[PDB]
Amino acid sequence: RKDNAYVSVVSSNYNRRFTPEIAKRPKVRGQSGRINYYWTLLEPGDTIIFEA
Amino acid sequence: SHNGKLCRLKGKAPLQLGNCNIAGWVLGNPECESLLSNRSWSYIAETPNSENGTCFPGDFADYEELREQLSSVSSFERFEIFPKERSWPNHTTRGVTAACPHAMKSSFYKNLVWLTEANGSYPNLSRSYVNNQEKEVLVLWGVHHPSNIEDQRTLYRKDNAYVSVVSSNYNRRFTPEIAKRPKVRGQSGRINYYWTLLEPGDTIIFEATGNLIAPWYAFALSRGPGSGIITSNAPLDECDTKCQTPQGAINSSLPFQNI
Ligand SMILES: *[C@@H]1O[C@H](CO)[C@@H](O[C@@H]2O[C@H](CO)[C@@H](O[C@@H]3O[C@H](CO[C@H]4O[C@H](CO[C@H]5O[C@H](CO)[C@@H](O)[C@H](O)[C@@H]5O)[C@@H](O)[C@H](O)[C@@H]4O)[C@@H](O)[C@H](O[C@H]4O[C@H](CO)[C@@H](O)[C@H](O)[C@@H]4O)[C@@H]3O)[C@H](O)[C@H]2NC(C)=O)[C@H](O)[C@H]1NC(C)=O
Ligand SMILES: *[C@@H]1O[C@H](CO)[C@@H](O[C@@H]2O[C@H](CO)[C@@H](O)[C@H](O)[C@H]2NC(C)=O)[C@H](O)[C@H]1NC(C)=O
């Protein structure tokens, strides 16, 4: 329900912002959209914050 | 002991770059016209100070990776990926610049096409290409970053534009940036150059609402077991030597050297 959106992942060693992109892509496994995957390693005593 | 001359290696002549570096050969610099002919080689030779590369200023993304990929290449087959007169009917493809001379005139690269407005409007752009040549295809393009908003408005009729290049292994979106820059070769704008390799059976899609230096010619590469790049100043002549150094050729069977 929004033309523009953002994802923010903040930690004490991670701080990144992601903006979705819309385009026409070749079909892989029958789908044209994409999902990009990300990972991090939380240390003991640390806090991770997800905003979306 | 060495001859002091570059020469043959197993019956195949080397590719002498001359006054061009790798950027001027792959982009099609106007002073590097003799290097754009279907051919094959054994190795590549460089003059140490070659000053005919990117005549329009900018950043070549991943130069050294392109050099490492072009080290183990035997031959290329240059073909026309997008015909200039056919594929762009709603834009003006006649774009020249004074930062790249040719014969006391102004010209552009021989493998790229500068697209500008036509009849006061820049329509949306979307092209595709499918690889069917059973080998890898090297594709090159560029994104323009002007100096002021008046240049952008006079050449593209939009303040905001974007370029999108999507393949099955490449997916990247580009936005132009406008700022004040120091003058390099008489121009303050920039053009940033980019490259990719299409696998066999893959499709590349270009989309643009502005600021695109579209591809014109592409290379079909073949791999080989033994090749390399040598930086040297010795003149080319004839031999059939099995060993080659930058300082000359070697013909013996002793197990060591100090050349
Ligand atoms: C601090 O920095 C910021 C950012 O760097 C500065 O913000 C910029 O200020 C300038 C000047 O105020 C703005 O330019 C203005 O844009 C207006 C909106 O443009 C609309 O109309 C355009 C019409 O296009 C036609 O005209 C242009 C020339 O304007 C031609 O180049 C073009 O070929 C066409 O013929 C549309 O194209 C556009 O999409 C918009 O719909 C303009 O109205 C305005 O024009 C005035 O100035 C012209 C001379 O430049 C003159 O010829 C006109 O008659 C008119 O008087 C002007 O171009 C920037 O848009 C603005 N940037 C942003 C991001 O907003 C800020 O000014 C600066 N602070 C200080 C103190 O300098
Ligand atoms: C190819 O290289 C030559 C020299 O290596 C370039 O000639 C120089 O051009 C600049 C202008 O940018 C002059 O200031 C120099 O005086 C020129 N030097 C000589 C020796 O002529 C030439 O412009 C290059 N051509 C391209 C297309 O990049």
Ligand SMILES: *[C@@H]1O[C@H](CO)[C@@H](O[C@@H]2O[C@H](CO)[C@@H](O)[C@H](O)[C@H]2NC(C)=O)[C@H](O)[C@H]1NC(C)=O
């Ligand atoms: C370089 O090789 C390409 C093929 O890789 C040649 O392009 C072919 O040219 C012939 C004759 O015009 C056409 O019938 C083919 O359809 C073309 N093939 C492709 C895929 O474009 C090109 O002409 C060669 N150039 C030379 C001789 O330097």
